[PDB]
Symmetry: C2
Subunit: 140 residues, 2 copies
Amino acid sequence: EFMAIERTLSIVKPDAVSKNHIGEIFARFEKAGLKIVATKMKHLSQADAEGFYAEHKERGFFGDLVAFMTSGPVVVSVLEGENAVLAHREILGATNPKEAAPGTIRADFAVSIDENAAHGSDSVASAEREIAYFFADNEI
Amino acid sequence: EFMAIERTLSIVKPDAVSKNHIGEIFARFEKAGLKIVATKMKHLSQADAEGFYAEHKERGFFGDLVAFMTSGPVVVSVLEGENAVLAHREILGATNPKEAAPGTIRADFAVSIDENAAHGSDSVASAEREIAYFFADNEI
């Protein structure tokens, strides 16, 4: 092979979970060569959401963020493949559905940046943190 | 509504998990009106498999069954919708891929009855048992 095989965290956010887009979104991962090496549907508690987005507790958007990310069940998943992080974010599209490319998850399943269907790790380093927060290594 | 809303257990068996058909299979559930109200990828231990298929421990096929169902990771999921049990089994098709209808999961993702891509509860009563074996009720 050619690119390092990486692991990245996926969260199908509550909007997309309530609109039954899990399989569809999953399929797009799989189609693009990413493998699902862990996954679980979870109802986040406030403490769950806060702890995960701890890095932004002092931020303006934090409160609304936490309320949304706990408004309904999410699916957290670990994807794995060559160049996983960057290639995940390419399937998702820009964080803002307005700015996102055609045929991306953010373009087809999300309307606003407040509720953008999916979370992807933006870095290998954060992917390591973000993955370790939701999954024991045994669980993968 | 018209039919009782039921809950049924889904296992994407290891063949289909290794061939990256989760999203695709999930999508077919969702498309057909079934909602995923719980799910997790799990590597079954022998004791896991045996305990779940306990009803057939004295059967000829049991050993091969257990070895397959523990040969790779599976996804266990709880589906919910009107007439969930019977409508699940309709999307899956006949347990035997040979006898299964076009456009069913067993037809498109499975070759033999030994490795038939997916498990579905065949009854409301078993669905209650099968669901309670893999999921705490909190978890749903």
